[PDB]
Amino acid sequence: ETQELASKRVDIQNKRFYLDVKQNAKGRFLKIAEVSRLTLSMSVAVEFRDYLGDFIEHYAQLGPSALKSEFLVRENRKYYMDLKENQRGRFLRIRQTVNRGPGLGSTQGQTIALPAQGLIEFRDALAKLIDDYGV
Amino acid sequence: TQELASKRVDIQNKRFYLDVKQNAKGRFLKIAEVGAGGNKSRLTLSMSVAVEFRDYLGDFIEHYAQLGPSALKSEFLVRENRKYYMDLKENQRGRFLRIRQTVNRGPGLGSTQGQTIALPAQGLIEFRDALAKLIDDYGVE
Amino acid sequence: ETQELASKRVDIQNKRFYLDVKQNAKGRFLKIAEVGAGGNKSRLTLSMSVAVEFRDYLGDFIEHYAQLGPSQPPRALKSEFLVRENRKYYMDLKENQRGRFLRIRQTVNRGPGLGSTQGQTIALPAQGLIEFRDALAKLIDDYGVE
Amino acid sequence: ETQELASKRVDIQNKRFYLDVKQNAKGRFLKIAEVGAGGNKSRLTLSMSVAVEFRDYLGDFIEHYAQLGPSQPPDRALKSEFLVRENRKYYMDLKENQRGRFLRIRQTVNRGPGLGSTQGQTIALPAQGLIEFRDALAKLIDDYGVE
């Protein structure tokens, strides 16, 4: 039975993300729901934490007006991370795909969009779930 | 006293206006937090002073980005008759930069009262950027 | 009056540097600007004569950077100091968690740093030091004297 | 099958390079994927033994690049090296085009016809990143190599 060990809430402009660390008898993993839904192993969650730091850095150094991308393939899942910008402002979009195993053949590629203002809070929340629970 | 330009910045559920203006003696910025505070929550900076302020924000941004999960930082700025107190704090609702501006009453006596804005830390990069643009525009070379 | 003689853009990671050669009645000189977030407080000034000595210092930082090997307040790896023509140039190779960089701070030189310094600072990501030295060397071959 | 032990991304100009340490039933090895600005991906595969030699060779390219001085006008590779270890060859050429110098590494089969585009198993490191790349490689070798 998958039982959540912790929830986390991050408010950014008028959007909300929940970071739930869950564990079924397979192991421990992270879920990230918007106001779609990513699922990450803790090991992959570490890579995100660090990549978020890369993104934060780049955003702080932009100054006034993709800007930056990362490409991650881990355990049958592929993650695209694009720091972009548009009329209303800068954001980080994260798309999760199945590129192998059960679930291939799609209708369900997952996506979340974080406003850039909240990357630091979102990274800080992730970091502490890693901190507490480890890999 | 000309209006030269405005820029608006929404941070979380709070709104700020950076307004450039000129009068003889020079150009200057007015930064207001929208609320019930009126002029109590509105700063006034010369252009010279805006630059030093922009740079201080650079430093607050760096401190905030490396806090990790958790006054955290204080800086200080005085020019002509005006003092600017900058304090990166955290209360239960999150991290913020409090800028309190004072007008010196005379040789070695602080104001009984000042004006103050509070920026949620998640908005500092936006704020800094809006301010940087207006500085690049409205008085160099 | 100031003639604009030449201009060179050097892109290094997510930074852009401009090297402008100018000339006034006193002689030829460089202005070196870093673009972005910071202001025109990221503006170095150097006669051609001093730009030569700066090029040579950059060769030593390049050697040191190449010999660091993999990494591990901020750690000061190599510091050098150039004072010339009533200006002081501090050159510190440093590293943080996010990479290695050469920070150059220019001040106006009176006594043992007495008055207003006029702290102009640029920060070259270390990756770019050879590109930067090279652009500078070209401008010196083209516009310097002997 | 293959387990993923460690990753490191090096940003050089508008490209990215992923150095991945992996292990299969036979061996531990390194995959190096270049991602171009436009989406182009290409890669090398190195045994950990070979990465040591590649890292050493990078040191030679670094020394050469640092000593070049700026591109002079025309009047071809500025420097070539060659690496052969059993079933894989690697052609290392330091070149320049209008946008800079770069180290092309081109991996081929040693015995076998070959398969796939030559570009898909070639990478081009902008020379500016040789030091950071060699350093990131040196670290992965330190922390997951036995050699």
Author numbering:
A (entry chain C): 57 to 91, 98 to 127, 142 to 211
B (entry chain D): 58 to 127, 142 to 212
C (entry chain A): 57 to 128, 139 to 212
D (entry chain B): 57 to 131, 141 to 212
From the paper:
Mutations in the human PURA gene cause the neurodevelopmental PURA syndrome. Based on the crystal structures of PURA from Drosophila melanogaster (dmPURA), three conserved sequence regions termed PUR repeats I, II, and III were identified to fold into globular domains. Whereas PUR repeat I and II assemble into an N-terminal PUR domain via intramolecular interactions, two C-terminal PUR repeats III from different molecules interact with each other and thus mediate dimerization of PURA. All these PUR domains belong to the class of the PC4-like protein family, which mainly bind single-stranded nucleic acids and can unwind double-stranded DNA and RNA.
CD spectra had already suggested that this mutation has no dramatic effect on the overall domain folding. To assess if this variant has a rather local effect on the structural integrity of PURA that may not be detectable by CD spectroscopy, we solved the crystal structure of hsPURA I–II R140P at 2.15 Å resolution. The crystals of R140P variant protein exhibited the same space group, unit cell parameters, and crystal packing as the wild-type protein. The R140P variant is located at the end of the flexible linker between PUR repeats I and II connecting helix α1 to the strand β5. Because of its position in a flexible region, the mutated residue is partially visible only in one out of four PURA chains in the asymmetric unit. The overlap of the R140P-variant structure with the PURA I–II WT fragment confirmed our previous observation about the unusually high flexibility of the strands β4 and β8 forming the β-ridge. Since no major structural differences were visible between hsPURA I–II WT and R140P variant (average r.m.s.d. of 0.89 Å for 133 Cα atoms aligned), we concluded that this genetic variation is unlikely to impair the structural integrity of hsPURA. In contrast, hsPURA I–II R140P did not show impaired RNA binding. In contrast, hsPURA I–II R140P variant showed wild-type-like separation of dsDNA, further supporting our previous interpretation from RNA-binding analyses that the genetic variant R140P is likely functional.
